[PDB]
């Protein structure tokens, strides 16, 4: 039934596949590849596939449920870098594209997500980046790891870019029913933002999380469960925020985005995220060439 194509064998790409091939998330995995078959190949050591089959070039997006972008590699040069070999990838990827939904994973996902849509000339509601979906998964985890409580009641998102200005969404966060009012939390915030950075520092790269990160949102999209999650979309209309990419919970499936949930924030919140939205927006000047 299901088909996935994921761009780039890197540690991403690899790891990516790895993941959803243990887990099994879909019945086709294809490695295109930049420069690819011998990581697929180690893969496929663990051959009991029994319900999956991973092979290796961009003919292969033909009838994809997904297309996962992880290509990409002195900080705004690396935005306007990886929008050189997002460009690229998105023409091949185009030149074979037919039914499916393009899932960007670069970084700065929140501009290269943007840009592809663009490049791409596809529906908005069709291209998606991996946004801050991640990091509002660890956002209700470190709040049920701190309150006694389990990530199944928890219920909170982590919205906007997904960098220094992501902001979380506290005013639409409760526990079972309970607003965060218990009885501070400036922290769980914090961690949540400098994960990313600390874990460069030490193992100087990341590609495991996100890596998961994707599997999940492949598994959503696949599934077509209505299930919300804070990916990345091209936002136009909303809190005031008009041509920029940004995350905001959105129920998605294997053929588009359904809705991009229209969250009553408060004013704070309205600001903190139209703020953030114009962060992405600085570079996305800088890059549009």
């Known amino acids: 039934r299901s088909k996935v194509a994921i761009i780039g064998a890197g540690f991403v790409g690899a ?15 294809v490695l295109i590849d930049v420069f690819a078959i011998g990581e697929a190949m180690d893969i496929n ?28 590699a002195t900080r705004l040069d690396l935005a306007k870098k990886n929008v050189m070999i997002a460009k690229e990838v998105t023409q091949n990827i185009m030149k074979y594209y037919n039914h499916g939904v393009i899932l960007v994973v ?3 996902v929140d501009i290269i997500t943007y ?27 470190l709040l049920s790891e701190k309150l006694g409580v389990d ?39 914090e961690d949540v933002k400098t994960a990313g950075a600390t ?15 994707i599997n999940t949102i492949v598994e959503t999209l696949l599934k077509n469960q209505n299930t919300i999650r804070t990916v990345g979309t091209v936002i136009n209309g909303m809190y005031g ?3 920029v990419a940004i995350s905001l919970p ?3 499936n294997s053929e588009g985005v359904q809705e991009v949930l229209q969250f009553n924030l408060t004013p704070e919140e309205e600001e903190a995220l139209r703020f953030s939205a114009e962060q992405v927006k600085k570079v996305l000047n800088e890059v549009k060439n």
């Open 151 to 189: 990530v199944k009641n928890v219920h909170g998102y982590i919205i906007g870019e997904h960098g220094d200005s992501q902001l979380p969404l506290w005013s639409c966060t409760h526990i079972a029913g309970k607003n965060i009012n218990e009885y501070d939390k400036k922290k769980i915030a």
């Open 241 to 243: 925020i008009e041509d």
């Open 106 to 108: 670069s970084n700065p």
């Open 45 to 72: 050591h663990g051959l009991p596939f029994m319900g999956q089959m991973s092979l290796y070039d961009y003919s292969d997006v033909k009838d994809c449920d997904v297309i996962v972008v992880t290509a990409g």
């Open 15 to 29: 790891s990516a596949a790895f993941t959803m091939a243990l887990r099994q998330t879909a019945n086709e995995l």
């Open 115 to 141: 840009m592809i849509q663009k490049w791409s000339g596809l529906p908005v509601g069709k291209v998606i980046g991996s946004g801050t979906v991640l990091d509002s998964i660890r956002f209700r985890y």
């Open 199 to 213: 874990i460069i520092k030490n193992k100087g790269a990341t590609y495991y999380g996100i890596a998961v990160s």
């Open 250 to 252: 959105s129920i998605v």
